[PDB]
Design a protein around this ligand. Structure first.
Ligand SMILES: *[C@@H]1O[C@H](CO)[C@@H](O[C@@H]2O[C@H](CO)[C@@H](O[C@@H]3O[C@H](CO)[C@@H](O)[C@H](O)[C@@H]3O)[C@H](O)[C@H]2NC(C)=O)[C@H](O)[C@H]1NC(C)=O
Ligand SMILES: *[C@@H]1O[C@H](CO)[C@@H](O[C@@H]2O[C@H](CO)[C@@H](O)[C@H](O)[C@H]2NC(C)=O)[C@H](O)[C@H]1NC(C)=O
Lengths: 156, 437, 49, 49, 49
């Protein structure tokens, strides 16, 4: 039984493009090595190029009668993982997308709630200290509190 | 000494089990599974083969009523036809004109190749995992066969290993299985006696030698064409050939977790699932006394390079101060890093280089060498190669430890933001307490 | 690159210099046989045709 | 492994290109231009003697 | 390839002439003898070796 010629392999980010050149029809069966197989079996009869995904768990492609070949995918990603929050965010986005976006969204939301709550507490303090002085007939508003808190500009 | 670890059930991963008996030099037992087999139990409900539609030569009787009794043979169809006038080469078969009767017989049996070519159906339950584990420690390096379940014990160089049941009871084979020569499929085959014609199971029998046989292949044999002797039979073609042509995608190319199914002792090999818990009872003769092992003092660890590749892409160096030249265990207490080397050589010069594989941007682990601990915080940069042909040599843990550059920024931002927030709470409390009186 | 257009390369028709990456991975002979097995990406020029 | 640098076009300059594939010891690849020829295309409109 | 740790650089002499007029001494702690690449990441200086 013949052995089909080994395909040229072009590496990509979490995918690999094969360039299959049968001389007579052959099977090409690829499966990922994870929880969900993501299998696909196909006869090839003319020279084609096929992109097959290679998740971090691993992929195995079986071309013709050669032994199956297993390729795995390294944690390649774009962005420097140690400089400025922008590059770390990019690093994680490349590695595990759609989860770090959740992470940054959650962190940013918590930061916003913290900022807003703190600022509201500050303005509440402003009120609780200045409203005793706006309901008096005589707008004293001693310049200590006048500077320390933005003073209402009482109008004699 | 009774000790208990869990090793990943991934073929080829070197698992470094660290054994720390106080009063003895720590021993690193490196074990890796060279191959694992998961054989399900079988039941052999029935088999299905190419069938032979045997029809005998008809009895076209010369003007006498003949009627055949239905004998218990598989899918027997026996029928009598009136008014046949067979004609053979020389001439008419029987002189008497219209009263000739044809008796046509038809039955189906297993093919003459049924013993060789047959897809056999089973039901599968449980699964007995049977592995080969290569153990290595001191000067002992041996591969042993272990039934991975809490029963089988294997003695290797005086140490006794029990490899416990898998953490996950997952099996690749569903309840109902069919097996052809090399490949296996999982499909709800019809029970015995309920095979529809044409589809898989049109011809069924218990064993490859059993004489019972059940078949509904629809032998609605018909009336002979006038003036010629033959037995016309129509019948749906063999269901085995149909099942051959539209099997579906076999389990050999569907199996999750990337295990290969072999056939004869039907089994699923190298399935990367779960953890094997191992309990080891080791004798005192396999350990090394403290008094005859180097004593390491003031061990401080710095990482030379850190590339979290699948291969052993990080290198760190240990600076120490020993007292005698000798070799001793080295092991990383956290699965954030896995060290390639198990026994390290210690010279009087305080420098030993080790290679470690990681997956975290900031792997922080405490490396232990010859009974002393040091901490190693690194900072890895990602690899640029995308596809490599070897499996991962690191447990896939990614969460960087605190004081890593990444989460240290989060710590600083959170600390400052929260500090201003608690300052806000402080000022609110101050103003409200001042106002309260 | 092998297989695609440009498997063979040559500056002129009559030039001597030549560049080829046709992936000639000659393999081990089968036992009991004289031959020279080679697995090679077919000519990229016919693919281009 | 694809790397992309720029080197000044001055004859004699030893340019030290630093190539760093993580997981391998960086290699410094040194190149220098020994002579560069800028050959214009021509048309030969006429000749005079 | 040798693995270098705790590398501190001190410049011995600095004379920015056209030739290689600066000499710097590199202190380090290696683990085995061997050759390895050296390169200055900025074009402010170019190393002869
Ligand atoms: C030799 O040839 C003669 C001539 O045919 C055969 O005689 C046939 O004998 C059978 C015996 O039953 C007759 O069949 C009967 O016919 C009646 C009337 O049609 C029908 O009601 C009965 O149910 C039965 O079928 C047949 O008529 C008769 N042939 C003729 C032409 O009368 C004889 O049997 C042959 N002998 C041998 C040894 O071949
Ligand atoms: C333990 O013994 C086995 C017995 O051979 C060693 O395994 C082989 O090592 C040779 C050495 O080059 C390799 O060529 C083989 O491929 C190995 N066989 C297998 C099945 O892997 C093993 O190396 C020994 N342990 C150590 C640490 O060397």
């Amino acid at each position: 039984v013949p052995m089909a010629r080994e395909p040229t392999v072009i590496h990509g980010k979490r995918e690999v493009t094969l360039h299959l050149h049968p001389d007579h029809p052959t099977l090409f069966s690829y499966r990922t090595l994870g929880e969900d197989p993501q299998y696909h079996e196909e006869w090839v009869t003319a020279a084609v190029e096929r992109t097959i995904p290679v998740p971090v768990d691993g992929m195995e492609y079986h071309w013709g009668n050669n032994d199956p070949v297993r390729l795995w995918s390294q944690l390649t990603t774009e962005g420097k993982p140690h400089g400025w929050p922008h590059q770390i965010v990019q690093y994680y986005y490349g590695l595990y997308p759609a989860a770090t976006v959740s992470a940054v969204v959650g962190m940013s939301l918590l930061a916003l709630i913290s900022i807003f709550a703190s600022c509201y507490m500050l303005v509440a303090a402003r009120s609780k200290c200045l409203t005793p002085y706006a309901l008096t007939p005589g707008a004293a508003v001693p310049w200590t509190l006048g500077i320390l808190c933005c003073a209402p500009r009482a109008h004699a | 000494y009774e000790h208990s670890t869990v090793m990943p059930n991934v073929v080829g991963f070197p698992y470094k089990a660290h054994i720390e008996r106080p009063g003895y030099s720590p021993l690193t037992l490196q074990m890796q599974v060279v191959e694992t087999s998961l054989e399900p139990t079988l039941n052999l409900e029935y088999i299905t083969c190419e069938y032979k539609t045997v029809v005998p030569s008809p009895y076209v009787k010369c003007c006498g009523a003949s009627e055949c009794s239905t004998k218990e043979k598989p899918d027997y169809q026996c029928k009598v036809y009136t008014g046949v006038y067979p004609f053979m080469w020389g001439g008419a078969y029987c002189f008497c004109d219209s009263e000739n009767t044809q008796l046509s017989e038809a039955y189906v049996d297993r093919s003459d190749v049924c013993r060789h070519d047959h897809a056999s159906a089973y039901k599968a339950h449980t699964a007995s995992l049977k592995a080969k584990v290569r153990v290595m420690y001191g000067n002992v390096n041996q591969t042993v066969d272990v039934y991975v379940n809490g029963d089988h014990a294997v003695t290797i160089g005086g140490t006794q290993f029990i490899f416990g049941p898998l953490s996950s009871a997952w099996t690749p084979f569903d309840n109902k299985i069919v097996v052809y020569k090399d490949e296996v499929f999982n499909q709800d085959f019809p029970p015995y006696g309920s095979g529809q014609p044409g589809r898989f199971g049109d011809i069924q029998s218990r064993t490859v030698e059993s004489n019972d046989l059940y078949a509904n292949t629809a032998l609605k044999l018909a009336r002979p064409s006038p003036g010629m002797v033959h037995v016309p039979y129509t019948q749906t073609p063999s269901g085995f050939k149909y099942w051959l042509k539209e099997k579906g995608t076999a389990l050999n190319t569907k199996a999750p977790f990337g295990c290969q199914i072999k056939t004869n002792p039907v089994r699923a090999m190298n399935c990367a699932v779960g953890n094997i818990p191992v309990s080891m009872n080791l004798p005192d003769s396999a350990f090394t006394r403290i008094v005859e092992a180097p004593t390491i003092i003031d061990l401080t660890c710095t990482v030379a390079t850190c590339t979290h590749s699948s291969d052993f892409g990080g290198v760190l160096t240990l600076t120490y101060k020993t007292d005698k030249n000798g070799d001793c265990s080295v092991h990383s207490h956290s699965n954030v890093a896995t060290l390639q080397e198990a026994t390290a050589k210690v010279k009087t010069a305080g420098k030993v280089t080790l290679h470690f594989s990681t997956a975290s941007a900031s792997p922080s682990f405490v490396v232990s060498l010859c009974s002393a601990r040091a901490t190693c915080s690194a900072s890895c940069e990602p690899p640029k190669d995308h596809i490599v042909p070897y499996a991962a040599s690191h447990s896939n843990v990614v969460f960087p430890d605190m004081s890593g550059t990444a989460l240290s920024w989060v710590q600083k931002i959170s600390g400052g933001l929260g500090a201003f927030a608690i300052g806000a709470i402080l000022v609110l409390v101050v103003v409200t307490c001042i106002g309260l009186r």
